[PDB]
């Protein structure tokens, strides 16, 4: 599982969770916690489980937020009856299928694919791609993508992929779509 | 045919009282013996209250001598068996019998009767249609979710029993004293376009049924 | 006035003969009938032997009774045993009172393998209404009976809200079912999880997502 060597880039914060009441971000990198040198995914993991093992209750936590290096006090989830701090690993929005005759197929859409920017805004989950894409109705929709692996040398060309694709109204529910599923 | 079904089970709290039925058909009821005899999973198949052909003569089980007494009505070809001060113990499936002399020759379905201080707990019915993806197939299984009842049994029918074959209702787990289960059928993908796929499920302890219909999602 | 002895277990091999025996503890086995029913998972008793050595009509003539005086074991032989044969089998006899033996649960081994059907259940969204998120996967199809659930979530192990039925024989195969208890919030925060079957040393498995296609 990829995400356990990734840095801590927090995506996805539960709802009323301990990384939300004490006002973790979507965006936040953490770096320490308690202590334990949190580089990866796995460092604060394995630290999380020590923490409650050694019966730690609060602890101080430092995350990235701007490049601008935070401090705060952090309840320590109890890991054997079941708590968790709440956060949740970006989402990279890449296409997992493209549907046979649908709009992104039209266009030529790939799976592979990396959204990169939606109608001019730059976005870095799945799930900002399905907000800018329900948004925008029936309208059509900007799509900046980075397609296969760059030549060497070339990896930081700034040069994309740009589609432009209208969105097709489902005939029995009235629901617009583009024909894009997500990668699992 | 010789048929026996019993009715009466469900839910009771100890020291309460339950009585079973046992409808009895396909036979001459008045010239044999008719008997009770129950099962745990730990304990096996225990005899405990046998009635004779004339309903002149009784006996019972040692754990239940006292408690429990066995009765017939030659003219409802019925037999009952009345339980009192019933204990965590008598939580089991109770089956009525036929006698044949020196053995056992039919058996009922059995009725689960529970002795708890826990209360009844209707399910919760969800339906479960597959996640959207690419590609269909050619068939498609669908499922019903019966979640968190107390206590069991439960059964799951599909379209009043029309849909028979690619029935699968699974074994039910227990977490913090309720019941989950699922029960999944298999159709053409064909039927499911064209017809209404519909999952009934029963509670008898808590009176219920719910009939659920799957649609896709 | 006694109690009949049975093993608890008895396994054979698919078309073998088997016998499965039932001893009394107290008084000549000879002295009363010994009566056999055969049950089957979540269904009643039918009767294989009567009166020591009969069979009813529709019993097939692969069920034999005997009685054994030096070993004061009444014995029921199966031969050709097949699939349907896997059930409990109790032994019954009686003189004041009534005793069942505590039955034999008859294995089959050496049935055609068979590698476990995975069909995977998103939460309904009726259930989501109320904040909550069962994440189902069935197994069917399989044998032998012997499997190892686990789930993932982004691939990494999950052991909390887990609840595993164990294998159990419903037509001529073996069905199990496991259920990962969630919230929505839970639910809606992962990419992926994943239902991994392990059966005789080979991984099987069906992953879900919240993530929605557009």
């Known amino acids: 599982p990829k995400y356990l060597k990734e840095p801590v880039v927090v995506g996805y914060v539960q709802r009323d969770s301990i990384a939300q009441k004490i006002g973790i971000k979507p965006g936040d990198k953490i770096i320490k916690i308690n202590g334990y040198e949190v580089r990866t995914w796995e460092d604060l993991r394995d630290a999380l489980i020590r923490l409650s093992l050694d019966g730690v209750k609060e602890t101080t936590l430092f995350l990235e937020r701007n490049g601008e290096v935070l401090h705060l006090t952090i309840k320590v989830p109890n890991v054997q009856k079941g708590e968790e701090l709440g956060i949740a690993p970006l989402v990279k929005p890449v296409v997992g299928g493209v549907k046979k005759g649908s709009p992104a197929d039209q266009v030529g859409i790939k799976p592979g694919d990396l959204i990169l920017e939606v109608n001019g805004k730059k976005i870095n989950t799945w799930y900002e791609l399905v907000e800018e894409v329900r948004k925008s109705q029936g309208k059509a929709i900007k799509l900046k993508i980075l397609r296969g692996v760059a030549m060497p040398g070339a990896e930081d060309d700034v040069v994309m992929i740009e589609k432009e694709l209208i969105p097709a109204k489902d005939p029995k529910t009235g629901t617009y779509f583009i024909g894009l599923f997500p990668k699992t | 045919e010789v048929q026996l079904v019993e009715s009466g089970g469900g839910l009771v709290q100890p020291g309460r009282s339950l009585k079973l039925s046992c409808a009895a058909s396909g036979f001459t009821f008045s010239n044999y013996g008719m008997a009770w005899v129950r099962q745990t999973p730990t304990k096996g198949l225990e005899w405990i209250a046998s009635?004779?052909?004339?309903?002149?003569?009784?006996y019972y089980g040692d754990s239940v001598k006292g408690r429990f007494s066995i009765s017939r009505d030659n003219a409802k070809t019925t037999h009952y068996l009345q339980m009192d001060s019933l204990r965590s113990e008598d939580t089991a499936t109770y089956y009525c019998?036929?006698?044949?002399?020196?053995?056992?020759?039919?058996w009922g379905q059995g009725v689960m009767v529970t002795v708890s201080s826990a209360e009844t707990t209707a399910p919760s019915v969800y339906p479960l249609a597959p996640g959207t993806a690419l590609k269909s197939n050619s068939m498609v299984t669908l499922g019903c979710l019966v979640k968190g009842y107390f206590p069991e049994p439960v059964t799951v029918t599909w379209n009043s029993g029309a849909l028979s074959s690619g029935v699968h209702t699974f074994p039910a787990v227990l977490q913090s004293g309720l019941y989950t289960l699922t029960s999944s059928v298999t159709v053409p993908s064909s039927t499911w376009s064209s017809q209404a796929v519909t999952c009934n499920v029963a509670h008898p302890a808590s009176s219920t049924k719910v009939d659920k219909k799957i649609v896709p999602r | 006035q006694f109690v009949l002895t049975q093993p608890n277990s008895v396994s054979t091999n698919l078309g073998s003969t088997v016998k499965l025996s039932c001893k009394r503890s107290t008084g000549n086995i000879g002295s009363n009938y010994v009566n056999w029913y055969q049950q089957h998972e979540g269904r009643s008793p039918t009767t294989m032997i009567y009166?020591?050595?009969?069979?009813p009509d529709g019993v097939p003539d692969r069920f034999s009774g005997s009685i054994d005086r030096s070993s004061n074991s009444a014995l029921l032989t199966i031969n050709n045993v097949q699939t349907e044969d896997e059930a409990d089998y109790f032994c019954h006899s009686y003189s004041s009172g009534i005793v069942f033996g505590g039955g034999t649960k008859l294995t089959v081994l050496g049935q055609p393998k068979s590698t476990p059907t995975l069909t995977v259940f998103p939460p309904s969204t009726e259930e989501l209404q109320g904040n909550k998120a069962t994440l189902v996967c069935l197994i069917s199809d399989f044998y032998p009976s012997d499997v190892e659930v686990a789930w993932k979530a982004n691939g990494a192990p999950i052991s909390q809200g887990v609840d595993t039925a164990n294998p159990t024989k419903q037509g001529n195969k073996y069905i199990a079912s496991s259920f990962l208890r969630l919230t929505a919030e839970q639910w809606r925060s992962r990419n992926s999880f994943t239902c991994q079957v392990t059966h005789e040393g080979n991984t099987v498995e069906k992953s879900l997502s919240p993530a929605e296609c557009v």
């Open positions: 009635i004779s052909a004339g309903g002149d003569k009784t």
């Open positions: 019998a036929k006698t044949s002399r020196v053995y056992f020759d039919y």
């Open positions: 009166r020591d050595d009969k069979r």
